[PDB]
From a paper:
Voltage-gated calcium (Cav) channels respond to membrane depolarization, allowing Ca2+ influx and translating electrical signals into intracellular Ca2+-mediated events.
This variant was named [name].2EM, as it was used for cryogenic electron microscopy (cryo-EM) imaging. Two glycan chains were observed, attaching to Asn345 and Asn1466 in the extracellular loops in repeats I and III (ECLI and ECLIII) via N-link. The first assembly site beneath the central cavity includes conserved residues Leu415, Leu1010, Phe1550, and Val1855, a common feature observed in the structures of all three members of [name] channels. A spherical density, likely corresponding to a Ca2+ ion, is surrounded by four residues, Glu378, Glu974, Asp1504, and Asp1808 (the EEDD motif) in the selectivity filter (SF). Examination of the 3D EM maps for all the structures, including that of the apo channel, identifies a well-resolved density in the cavity, which can be best fitted with a phosphatidylethanolamine (PE) molecule. The two hydrophobic tails penetrate the III-IV fenestration, and the polar head inserts into the central cavity, directly contributing to drug coordination.
Residue numbers in the entry: 96 to 160, 169 to 309, 338 to 425, 788 to 875, 881 to 942, 952 to 1019, 1282 to 1384, 1388 to 1564, ...
């Protein structure tokens, strides 16, 4: 019965059987219960539920009245309620949802998966301090957002009520709305605010009605069908949660810039730095620590010959492109015969040298054998076997022992990855079925839907990658209820929590006479500081450069003259230093260090700039190239600052241990790049027009007077293919590229939605394998840092007792906790009765703090009281509260000498009372301290991060400073808020790129061609653009990775 294993096997078979019937659910067809197919599935489910009742009875009879035994009881109890309730028509379909819990029974039946889930549950309790820090972020930023932006995103530009009445015409739509509709709302700034968008910015007609929408006031709805707004604490948290995931966080920022003020970017930069970066990556650090506490053939020349032969063949497959000349097609097949024959000869010699059994004694010889016969099989049989010619690159692991030793190490990582993958697949399956029950057949259809198991799993998988997950959220909220956000919050939270534990699991198994004067000047203590000032001033000159400076303006004269002065100063600095040390004859000479070589090259480039500028000659092309190099002069700051020099050299040394993983990742990119060209070259064209459903070929597109155009990210050649793979790896806009590959039909054929669903294997396989390499690169850097780190008064006394006793602290805690509750009750258009109730509460809390300060004064004495910082903090809030109450009362009276701005700020500043809880949070203070001790390392990396932005911010203005956007030449990523028109706007844009929010959209806008009519084009910008974004993304991520490692190491040694 119970003391034998086969009874558990039978239980596992029935549990697996339920997984099949749950996946067979059809949300559109089964909910009506009409089909015979349905009738037998409910019959199967009743059969399965009957067994589960029998199992529970037997195990009950055997044992008498363990989390996992409770769990089976909960599932049986809930199932019986649903099973027996059949008969009452009220909410029966909603109660059917409890069935999605049943696959959880597999956890306890599978031993290895049972142990893993035990470790997760034992590690969760300790995350209380991280959770406490999370509440502080959501409450502080939640209340601040509501008091600032409540009801503003309902603003629209309306017609004047007097205008519509006196003119006796009502055919006009009441408020301005774009031709697209309410999905693109024109949010306007009210007269009592200073937002970026006014009703005077409405375009004219394209018979002048648009100019009569001249009053800005509240409408009925907020953006995205009411999903995005700050009308209450509830909607504020949904907006904050989306920002913390760094998905569509700029669209939220643009709304409040249009409606309220430009300087709202401060709110989102602080929320992203504190909330997204530190508060999420402290979750990893905490788990990381806790989980740790818990005669011719054998010749060298012959081997080298075959080595280069394989390499040349592998690379020749990369010269394919869309419109090949047929003589190039024939050349590649001639080249195939030569190399195929060469490997065939190689096998023949080795078979004669060792005999067949001797040849089979080596596995790599067996592998090479299978490829040769498959290659010969293709030639004799003259598109299937062509793809398998990519396997020839695998022969190089024989001749690369260094890479061979890395591959086996990665393989040894995958024996524990398997355990986590099983738990994730069960995790994804449960949410995939849940989504079908909640949202099935209700997103009427969108590609991102839960109408079937295949696209339910893909949608759930997509949400975990956090790509357009906000688009699915708005569908869920609008279709069912605003409380549908908890589905996505739980999915992302638990999904990422489980993924951190995989990263930690790998880490822990990883740990297991004039010359005399010059020499004196160069050795002066103040030489570096004196030169650092000129470098700083030169940076200011670069920041002021922008395209809109008129050539004849005084600013141009100031900037041009400054260039000559700085050029002379740094020529003199170099000269004096070269005289002191010598150029390259001495051992201390100038060019004996790379930091001196860099300065030399910059000075040379500067001199060439003077020479070219002196030319009245056909040197326009060369001039623009030198302008780009002038943006690299700020790099001289690194060598003058010892702090930056150490960090910069540290990052370079950190690439050594992960050198082989990068090479394997690069080889993977090319193998998939070549494969993508073979699959999709020439098929990413499409017809662009208003009525296109009737078009099916290029010829019909031409006939319809439309235009035949190509996607920006495509696979027409290996150069285009690599750019597409990078966008997939970064997982920004990767879903759109996947649709193009799923809809590909052929050359000169219109793509058809979901034409080839089997192409999901190509795109999903690349994301998974690439993520596995990037996961092992982060581990490699951590393991290296760890290995190197470990190698390196009768009436007064009674009051004093009360103040000394803990009773006062608990009373203080209760009052502020109640205050936080009253601060969350504010909301747009709240009733006047609530206004009176809240202001009365403010009276009570202020009096309590005033007494709290008095008693503390009486107990401890003035100066001894004031010594403690916490006591100083109390006095500030008490003082802060008094001025806020005073301003409020006087303004509410008849006199009005105060600005409504000062009242707003004082009202917002009362959120500072939350800091009085921080004293009780001893655990959280220790966690925050862990970051405070890591500033000397994290601080220097921050300087490098800002220096990275400065060079690319200045470079961006030079490259993309003149790119326009218009209805004639539309742009997908750039807008009125994201531009490189000046250094200030370029800095803000790079922060968006750094977070990765739709950075791929900005690159598109630079890949699109120049107009035939317009001037100032750079015909080779589409070639420079990928290099700019690719290098920035990699360097930016690498720098931020080391910041996490710096904090991670300190916590381990500190603990
Ligand atoms: C740290 C705190 C938790 C952080 C978690 C972040 C994610 C929060 C998402 C959950 C909030 C979802 C509710 C949003 C909300 O209140 O607005 C929707 C709802 C209106 O729904 P209708 O579709 O019926 O609208 C039509 C109106 N006729 O608004 C309300 O009805 C207000 C009631 C709730 C007040 C706000 C407090 C909600 C409590 C949230 C707690 C979530 C905790 C999750 C850990
Ligand atoms: C482990 C993850 C847990 C997440 C599970 C919960 C999240 C999903 C929420 C889905 C339930 C929302 C309501 C479903 C529904 O359809 O209800 C009917 C009604 C209107 O929706 P119509 O699709 O019919 O609209 C089109 C017209 N036919 O929705 C509601 O108004 C729901 C009322 C509120 C339900 C939730 C209240 C919970 C509040 C407290 C939570 C704490
Ligand atoms: C100083 C010089 C530094 C040069 C860069 C060294 C190599 C790149 C470091 C690898 C790394 O950790 O960054 C990978 C990066 C971050 O991974 P996510 O998926 O978390 O990114 C999304 C976070 N917003 O990955 C990417 O951004 C995607 C690009 C491809 C990564 C693989 C690199 C292949 C080798 C080239
Ligand atoms: C990697 C090394 C080489 C092996 C890759 C095998 C790819 C298979 C190619 C065969 C093929 O042409 O079909 C692929 C198939 C598309 O279906 P149709 O051919 O019926 O399309 C009609 C053509 N007009 O889609 C796939 O399954 C290919 C996905 C790529 C495989 C990735 C797995 C590698 C690990
Ligand atoms: C060492 C560095 C970091 C010093 C600080 C950087 C500044 C030099 C940056 C930051 C703010 C920038 C300014 C932000 C806004 C403007 C207004 C704008 O001026 C105009 O000509 C108005 C635009 C229009 O005509 O519509 C563009 C240049 C300027 C002065 C920017 C020039 C570059 C500035 C001064
Ligand atoms: C070789 C590997 C190890 C490194 C990666 C370098 C790539 C960026 C190189 C390798 C082969 C190159 C390609 C070889 C041949 C062509 C065809 C050539 O075709 C055309 O002139 C287009 C004509 C048309 O189709 O209208 C355009 C450049 C391109 C794609 C090259 C772009 C740059 C590529 C992809
Ligand atoms: C290995 C990973 C990290 C990505 C590598 C970076 C790529 C995004 C870059 C490297 C070189 C770039 C290429 C350099 C030169 C060109 C010019 C131009 O190439 C062509 O001649 C093809 C255009 C055509 O079809 O005619 C268009 C883009 C392309 C291939 C670039 C596409 C983007 C590439 C492949
Ligand atoms: C302190 C944290 C844990 C939240 C729990 C405290 C509650 C007592 C507060 C939090 C936010 C408050 C809500 C904020 C705003 C609103 C919306 C208001 O009007 C609506 O229902 C809006 C309709 C819409 O959804 O558009 C009714 C009061 C209510 C629910 C408030 C009632 C009291 C709530 C639920
Ligand atoms: C740490 C990461 C911080 C980097 C992110 C940005 C840092 C602060 C710089 C970002 C703040 O500076 C940008 C402004 O200088 C832009 O000036 P504009 O003249 O363009 O004014 C805006 C447009 N209107 C309002 C005139 C129409
Ligand atoms: C323009 O707007 C103002 C303010 O709402 C209004 O008084 C005026 O009548 C409007 N003018 C026209 C021509 O609609
Ligand atoms: C599509 O085009 C065909 C001719 O090619 C025409 O007969 C048909 O009416 C069109 N269908 C629609 C509705 O556009
Ligand atoms: Ca994105």
């Amino acid at each position: 019965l119970v003391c034998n294993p086969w009874f558990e096997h039978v239980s596992m078979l029935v549990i697996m059987l339920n997984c099949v019937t749950l996946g067979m659910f059809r949300p559109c067809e089964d909910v009506e219960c009409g089909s015979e197919r349905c009738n037998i599935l409910e019959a199967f489910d009743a059969f399965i539920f009957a067994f589960f009742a029998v199992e529970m009875v037997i195990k009950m009879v055997a044992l008498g009245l363990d989390t996992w035994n409770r769990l089976d009881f909960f599932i049986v109890v809930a199932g019986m309620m649903e099973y027996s309730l059949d008969g009452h028509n009220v909410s029966l379909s909603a109660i059917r949802t409890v069935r999605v819990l049943r696959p959880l029974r597999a956890i306890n039946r599978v031993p290895s998966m049972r142990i893993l889930v035990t470790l997760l549950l034992d590690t969760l309790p300790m995350l209380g301090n991280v959770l406490l820090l999370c509440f502080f972020v959501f409450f502080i930023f939640g209340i601040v957002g509501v008091q600032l932006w409540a009801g503003l995103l309902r603003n629209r530009c309306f017609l004047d009520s007097a205008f519509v009445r006196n003119n006796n015409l009502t055919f006009l739509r009441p408020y301005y709305q774009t031709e697209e509709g309410e999905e693109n709302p024109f949010i306007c700034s009210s007269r009592r605010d200073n937002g970026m968008q006014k009703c005077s910015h409405i375009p004219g007609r394209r018979i002048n009605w648009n100019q009569y929408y001249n009053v800005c006031r509240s409408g009925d709805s907020n953006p995205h069908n009411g999903a995005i707004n700050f009308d209450n604490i509830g909607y504020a948290w949904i907006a904050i949660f989306q920002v913390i995931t760094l998905e569509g966080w700029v669209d939220i920022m643009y709304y409040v810039m249009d409606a309220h003020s430009f300087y709202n970017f401060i709110y989102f930069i602080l929320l992203i730095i504190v909330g997204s970066f530190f508060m999420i990556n402290l979750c990893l650090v905490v788990i990381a620590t806790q989980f740790s506490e818990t005669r011719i053939v054998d010749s060298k020349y012959f081997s080298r010959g075959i080595m280069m032969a394989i390499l040349v063949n592998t690379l020749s497959m990369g010269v394919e492109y869309h419109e090949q000349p047929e003589e190039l097609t024939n050349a590649l097949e001639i080249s195939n015969i030569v190399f195929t024959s060469m490997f065939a000869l190689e096998m023949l010699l080795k078979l004669l040298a060792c005999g067949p059994l001797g040849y089979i004694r080596n596995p790599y010889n067996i592998f090479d054998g299978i490829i040769v016969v498959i290659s010969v099989w293709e030639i004799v049989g003259q598109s299937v076997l062509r793809t398998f010619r990519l396997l020839r690159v695998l022969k190089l692991v024989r001749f690369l022992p260094a890479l061979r030793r890395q591959l086996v190490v990665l393989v040894k990582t995958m024996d524990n990855v398997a355990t986590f993958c099983t738990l994730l697949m069960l995790f994804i399956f449960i949410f995939s079925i849940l989504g079908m029950h909640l949202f099935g057949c209700k997103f009427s259809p969108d590609r991102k839907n839960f109408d079937s198991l295949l696209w339910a799993i893909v949608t759930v998988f997509q949400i975990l990658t956090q790509e357009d997950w906000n688009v699915v959220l708005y569908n869920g909220m609008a279709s069912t209820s605003s409380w549908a956000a908890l589905y996505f919050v739980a999915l992302m939270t638990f999904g990422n929590y489980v993924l951190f534990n995989l990263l930690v699991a790998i880490l822990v198994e990883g740990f297991q006479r004039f010359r005399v004067s010059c020499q004196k000047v160069i050795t002066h203590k103040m030489f570096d500081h004196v030169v650092l000032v000129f470098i700083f001033l030169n940076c200011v000159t670069i920041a002021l450069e922008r395209p809109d400076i008129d050539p004849g303006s005084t600013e141009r004269v100031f900037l041009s003259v400054s260039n000559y002065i700085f050029t002379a100063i740094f020529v003199a600095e170099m000269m004096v230093k070269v005289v002191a040390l010598g150029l390259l004859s001495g051992e201390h000479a100038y060019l004996q260090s790379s930091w001196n070589l860099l300065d030399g090259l910059l000075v040379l480039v500067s001199l060439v700039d003077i020479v070219v500028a002196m030319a009245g000659a056909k040197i326009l092309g060369v001039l623009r190239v030198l302008r780009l190099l002038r943006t690299l002069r700020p790099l001289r700051v690194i060598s003058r600052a010892p702090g930056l020099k150490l960090v910069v050299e540290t990052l370079i040394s950190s690439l050594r241990p992960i050198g082989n993983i990068v090479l394997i990742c690069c080889a993977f990119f090319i193998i998939f790049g070549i494969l993508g060209v073979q699959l999709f070259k020439g098929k990413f064209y499409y017809c662009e027009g208003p009525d296109t459903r009737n078009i099916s070929t290029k010829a019909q597109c031409r006939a319809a007077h439309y235009r035949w155009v190509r996607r920006k990210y495509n696979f027409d050649n290996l150069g285009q293919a690599l750019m597409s793979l990078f966008v997939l790896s970064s997982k920004d806009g990767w879903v759109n590229i996947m649709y193009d590959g799923l809809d590909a039909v052929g050359v000169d054929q219109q793509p058809v939605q979901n034409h080839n669903p089997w192409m999901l294997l190509y795109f999903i396989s690349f994301l998974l394998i690439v993520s596995f390499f990037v996961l092992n690169m982060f581990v490699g850097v951590v393991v290296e840092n760890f290995h190197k780190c470990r190698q390196h008064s009768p009436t007064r006394r009674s009051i004093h007792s009360l103040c000394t006793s803990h009773y006062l602290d608990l009373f203080i805690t209760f009052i502020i906790c109640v205050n936080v509750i009253t601060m969350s009750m504010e909301h747009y258009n709240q009733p006047k009765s609530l206004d009176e109730a809240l202001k009365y509460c403010n009276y009570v809390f202020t009096i309590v703090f005033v007494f709290e300060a008095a008693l503390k004064l009486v107990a401890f004495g003035f100066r001894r009281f004031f010594k403690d910082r916490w006591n100083q903090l109390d006095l500030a809030i008490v003082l802060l509260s008094l001025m806020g109450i005073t301003l409020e009362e006087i303004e509410m009276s008849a006199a009005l000498p105060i600005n409504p701005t000062i009242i707003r700020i004082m009202r917002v500043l009362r959120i500072a009372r939350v800091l009085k809880l921080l004293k009780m949070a001893t655990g959280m203070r220790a966690l925050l301290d862990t970051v405070v001790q890591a500033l000397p390392q994290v601080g220097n990396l921050g300087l490098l991060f800002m220096l990275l932005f400065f060079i690319y911010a200045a470079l961006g203005v030079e490259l993309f400073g003149r790119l326009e956007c218009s209805e004639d030449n539309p742009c997908e990523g750039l807008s009125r808020h994201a531009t490189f028109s000046n250094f200030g706007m370029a800095f803000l844009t790079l922060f968006r790129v750094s977070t990765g929010d739709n950075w791929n959209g900005i690159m598109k806008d630079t890949l699109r061609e120049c107009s035939r009519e317009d001037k100032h084009c750079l015909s080779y910008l589409p070639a420079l653009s990928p290099v700019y974004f690719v290098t920035f993304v990699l360097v930016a991520q690498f720098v931020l990775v080391n910041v996490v490692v710096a904090v991670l190491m300190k916590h381990l040694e500190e603990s």
